[PDB]
Structure formats: structure tokens, C-alpha cells
């Protein structure tokens, strides 16, 4: 086992949540890891809509914005290309996905337009991608709109590849909890009290994983932050372990890009 490197202890896992401890690591590294896990992991989402028939009570960009946030399966996103790089005109077969939506309110009672009715008509080339993410029991997923008697909606959707640094729709992580030093041994926070600070502030669940300090011990002025407690939840598109692994990979690639540029510049200086 790699005893010279960062250590990890998973305590809990599921389809959505991973709950773990990260030890023997700096604070800067853990912070950068969480920043990348939230902001810089690609995913597949709807990026353009064109509408044929709209006899609803809502607007057009309203429904466009509603569609732009629906989650879709993006496990194999490494085999697509940024549409600004593909040589195709407009959208490719290798640099986009295409879906169609059609609905009509034939019945007297109002009819809901969910996200289970998005149908893919492009060619996937045997890649696991484009499927809508469904997490409810009934399987309907995100409800999109509402229809009455004699109302129809027809439109076509183009979904592309990007990151969360340009829109919140491509983000695969909902919210990640990041804690450390629940006993305030390092004196990083200073408490606010009325009578007794030790009682007004509740205790974190994490206190059980460290030993309380003793009043006879002088302030330890040599310690550093080393143990962090994280919890990560996914929107649903990517598996959560893949979220963590891809965050690490993206950080590695960024540092490697820095290294390559530095080597190139050193070769230039040689000239």
C-alpha cells in the first residue's frame, strides 16, 4: 500500500452519497479538490431548442430554460468532442446529441408533460450517453409542462458537452460538506457567547472521531490541519466515485499542462 501518500477512509456510500475522511493531506489540496469537484467536470445537457408548435400558457424561452436543466446520462463523455473543435457544420454526429419532444392534450383532464417523453433520434454509435436520469418511484422524472384540451407542443433539442464554469446546468455535484478540527484545538475560530461558550454552541457529529482536549494541556503551537471530513452528493448523471476520480484526474491534467508549458518555455529559452 502507498504509505507515502494521502490516505482515505470511506465510511459510507450509496448511489448518491459518499461519506469519508481524508488524512495526511494539506488543506490547500483538499480545498482545490472540492473546488474542482464542483466546478470543472464535464457533463451532457441540453444546449439548444427549436419549437414548431406552442399552444400552451407558458412562454418559449421559459420552456427552453426549463429544458436546459434536465439531467441526462453522461458516463462516457470522454468520447464526445467540444462542438467548437469538431469539423462538422453546426452540430456533428460526433459532437452533439439530438432529441425530440411531442405532446398533445387530447383528453378533457389536464395532461402533464414530464421528461420521460424525450426521445433520442440521433445515432449513439454504441456509447452509453443521452439517457434521461430518472430517480422517482413512478419513473416520470422532471415534470416539464402542463396541457389542456386542444393544446399541443412540438420541439427539437440539441444537447452538447461543457463544464459548470460557464453554466450551472452542467454541474454534477449538488452540495459537498467539508469539516475539520471539531474541537478547535488549533484555535481557528473564536466563539461568541452570552454566559458560557462551551454550552451555547452545539457539538458536531464528528467529535466522536477525536479525543477531547484536557484543561491541563498548554496550547499546542506546532500542529497543522491534517484530517478532513467530507461528504459528496451527486445530481445523478455521473456516479459519485466517478465524480471524485474525475476531479482528481482533472487536477492532475491541469498540473501536467503547467508542466508541459514550462518544459516548452525552457526549450524556447535554450534557443
Amino acid at each position: 500500500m502507498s504509505e507515502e501518500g494521502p490516505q482515505v477512509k470511506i465510511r459510507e456510500a450509496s448511489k448518491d452519497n459518499v461519506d469519508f475522511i481524508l488524512s495526511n493531506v494539506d488543506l490547500a489540496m483538499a480545498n482545490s479538490l472540492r473546488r474542482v469537484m464542483i466546478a470543472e467536470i464535464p457533463t451532457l445537457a441540453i444546449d439548444s431548442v427549436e419549437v414548431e408548435t406552442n399552444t400552451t400558457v407558458l412562454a418559449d424561452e421559459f420552456i427552453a430554460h426549463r429544458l436546459g436543466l434536465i439531467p441526462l446520462q453522461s458516463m462516457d463523455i470522454e468520447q464526445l468532442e467540444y462542438s467548437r473543435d469538431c469539423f462538422c457544420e453546426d452540430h456533428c454526429d460526433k459532437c452533439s446529441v439530438v432529441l425530440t419532444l411531442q405532446a398533445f392534450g387530447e383528453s378533457e383532464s389536464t395532461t402533464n408533460v414530464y421528461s420521460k417523453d424525450l426521445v433520442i433520434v440521433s445515432n449513439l454509435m454504441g456509447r452509453n450517453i443521452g439517457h434521461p436520469i430518472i430517480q422517482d418511484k413512478e419513473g416520470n422524472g422532471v415534470l416539464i409542462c402542463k396541457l389542456r384540451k386542444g393544446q399541443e407542443l412540438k420541439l427539437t433539442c440539441v444537447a452538447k458537452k461543457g463544464i459548470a464554469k460557464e453554466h450551472a446546468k452542467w454541474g454534477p455535484a449538488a452540495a459537498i460538506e467539508f469539516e475539520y478540527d471539531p474541537w478547535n484545538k488549533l484555535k481557528h475560530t473564536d466563539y461568541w457567547y452570552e454566559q458560557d461558550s462551551a454550552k451555547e454552541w452545539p457539538q458536531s457529529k464528528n467529535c466522536e472521531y477525536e479525543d477531547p482536549p484536557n484543561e491541563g494541556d498548554p496550547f499546542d503551537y506546532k500542529a497543522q490541519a491534517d484530517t478532513f471530513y467530507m461528504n459528496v452528493e451527486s445530481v445523478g448523471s455521473i456516479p459519485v466515485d466517478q465524480v471524485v476520480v474525475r476531479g482528481i484526474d482533472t487536477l492532475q491534467k491541469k498540473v501536467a499542462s503547467i508542466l508541459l508549458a514550462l518544459t516548452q518555455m525552457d526549450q524556447d529559452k535554450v534557443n
Binding site: 461568541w192 452570552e194 503551537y221 506546532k222
Partner: protein, 335 residues
């Protein structure tokens, strides 16, 4: 009273304001489109014909660029319709009506203009979005806040006019007001709330933060102050880091109620050759008061040095306060 004493004018804009702590004291953020609409007639000379040629080639739909070309004879060519963005050859004495570029003087005011200090000059910086930007210390002479106020921008169109705006009406030259012979600007609001929490005897700083703070001061000389507690752990006191912003050669003495030459309440202020000996800094020191730090700095060094001082102090104290934190709640009104 409506067409001969005051009248509508050209080359002007009007927009809401906002606050920017990263801008210098005498610098204003101008939106991109407002910079694309107003112009300036620069004269083609041997020193600028290359940049001016590239500007004409750029066209009117790109910043920087140009919008019209005036010949020697008074004829004016619209660059948009004339395909000759890549064709017109410029000569000596022609004029290019170019966009407004960084470090162009402008006049800036708020209505009603009750006194002299409500109409001041600024240097432009082209920014995105639709608001104007101001340093948070000029909002006192303007009597302006950021809940919906709109101010007016006027552009000079010559060299004599530009020199007048740069040597007479500049913000640095309007600090000691002549109505009550005392400073009209100072550290205000949350920078003032922070520069006091920093200089208590309680506040000590580790190594990394001292390094970042010393980098933030743009006038640093690369020397790391020797700490005050060398052993058993190197630490820095807030007074020590804040002394870096203050120039060298500044001396200040202030004795408050019941303060001796060894202050037990940490009252008064002693500054010897740029170093804070003892004393917390607060409204009586870095505010708009007589005999404070701002007044002595202006009367000893000059307006430009005090203008630098405003931004040095703001940068250091805001960087520290970003990591300290501050709030207020209902628990502070309970007894």
C-alpha cells in the same frame, strides 16, 4: 435661463454607480458600450501612426477602434460605409476619431452640484457590464451611495481641455477642502471597521498570510520584516504588517485621556519613521479629521503619495478582513 445659461450637450453619458475596492482613488470604471459610443479626435503624428493605423484597420465594431477619419480639408469619412478600413492611408495632420482608451481624463459629477468638490476629474478603465465604478472613499464628497444613484460623465475633446482636467480638477488635489480647512475624504465604513480589529494587541499573524499580505502591497521592496516573536514560533503583529503601507519619514503623536508614555489602555498614537510604536488606529487617525494621518501625509509628501496610501491601506485591510470575517445579529441587542 433655459438656452443660454444651461443647455444640453454632446459627448456625455449618464448611468448608475457601484463600488470597487480594487480601483485606485482617482480611477473610474467605464462600461464597454459607453466606451464604444463616445470618441476622441487624436491627431496623426510620427509617434502614433502605427497604432492609429491598426486602430483604423480594427473598425467601429471592435474596441479599440475608430469611427470617423477627418482629412486636412475638413471632409469627414465614415469608416462604417467606406469599405476603406483596410484601405485608407493616413497622413500627417489627419484626425482619427478613436474610442476612449485607458487613462483618458473625464469629468464626473452628481446633481445637485452644491459645492466645488462635487465635480471632479478621473482616469478611465474600460470594464464589462453596465455600471460605473468608484473608489469607496470619494463617495463622501459626492454625497452618493449605491442604492440607485446615477451620475454624469463628460468627455473633453482637446489637449488644452485635457490638461485642465488633469492639473486642476483631479481627485488627488481635492482632499483638503477650503470650506472648513480639513480633509473631506478618509477611510470609511468597513475598511475603517477592519483597520481597528487589525491593530489590537491581541492580533498575531503567521508566515504564509504575512507573505501574501506583503505581496499585495504594490510598493513593497522585497524585504521581509523580522518577526516580533522569534521563538518558540515566528509571529507578526498586525501593527507590523500595517506599517508597510505607511511611507517612511512620517511622525505622529497623539495623547488621549489618561495615557502615559507607556500606554496601559493602548490609547493615543505614536508613529516614528513609519512604524506604529503604540496605539490603535480608528476614526480619529485614518478618518476625515484635523491633524490625522491623511492630513500630515498630504502636507508633508504630496497628494499623489496620499492617493497611493488610500489604496495600500484598503488592499491590506480588505485582504485581512476577507479571512477574518465579520457579521452582526440580534444577539448584539440583548442585555
Amino acid at each position: 435661463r433655459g438656452n443660454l445659461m444651461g443647455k444640453r450637450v454632446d459627448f456625455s453619458a449618464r448611468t448608475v454607480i457601484s463600488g470597487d475596492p480594487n480601483l485606485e482613488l482617482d480611477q473610474v470604471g467605464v462600461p464597454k458600450s459607453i466606451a464604444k459610443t463616445l470618441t476622441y479626435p487624436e491627431v496623426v503624428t510620427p509617434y502614433n501612426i502605427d497604432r492609429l493605423t491598426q486602430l483604423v484597420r480594427n473598425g467601429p465594431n471592435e474596441h479599440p477602434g475608430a469611427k470617423y477619419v477627418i482629412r486636412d480639408s475638413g471632409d469627414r469619412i465614415d469608416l462604417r460605409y467606406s469599405k476603406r478600413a483596410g484601405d485608407i492611408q493616413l497622413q500627417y495632420g489627419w484626425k482619427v476619431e478613436r474610442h476612449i482608451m485607458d487613462n483618458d481624463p473625464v469629468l464626473f459629477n452628481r446633481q445637485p452640484s452644491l459645492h466645488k468638490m462635487s465635480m471632479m476629474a478621473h482616469r478611465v478603465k474600460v470594464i464589462p457590464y453596465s455600471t460605473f465604478r468608484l473608489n469607496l472613499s470619494v463617495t463622501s464628497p459626492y454625497n452618493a451611495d449605491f442604492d440607485g444613484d446615477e451620475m454624469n460623465l463628460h468627455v473633453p475633446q482637446s489637449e488644452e481641455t485635457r490638461a485642465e482636467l488633469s492639473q486642476l480638477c483631479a481627485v488627488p488635489l481635492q482632499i483638503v477642502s477650503p470650506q472648513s480647512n480639513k480633509p473631506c475624504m478618509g477611510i470609511v465604513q468597513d475598511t475603517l471597521c477592519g483597520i481597528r480589529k487589525l491593530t489590537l494587541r491581541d492580533t498575531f499573524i503567521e508566515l504564509d498570510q504575512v507573505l501574501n499580505m506583503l505581496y499585495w502591497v504594490p510598493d513593497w521592496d522585497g524585504v521581509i520584516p523580522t518577526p516580533a516573536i522569534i521563538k518558540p514560533k515566528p509571529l507578526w503583529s498586525g501593527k507590523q504588517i500595517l506599517s508597510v503601507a505607511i511611507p517612511n519619514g512620517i511622525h505622529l503623536q497623539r495623547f488621549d485621556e489618561g495615557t502615559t508614555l507607556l500606554s496601559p489602555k493602548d490609547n493615543g498614537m505614536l508613529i516614528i519613521d513609519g512604524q506604529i510604536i503604540f496605539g490603535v488606529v480608528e476614526k480619529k487617525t485614518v478618518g476625515s479629521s484635523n491633524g490625522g494621518l491623511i492630513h500630515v501625509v498630504t502636507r508633508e509628501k504630496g497628494p499623489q503619495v496620499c492617493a497611493k496610501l488610500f489604496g495600500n491601506i484598503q488592499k491590506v485591510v480588505n485582504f485581512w478582513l476577507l479571512h477574518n470575517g465579520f457579521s452582526t445579529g440580534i444577539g448584539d441587542t440583548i442585555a
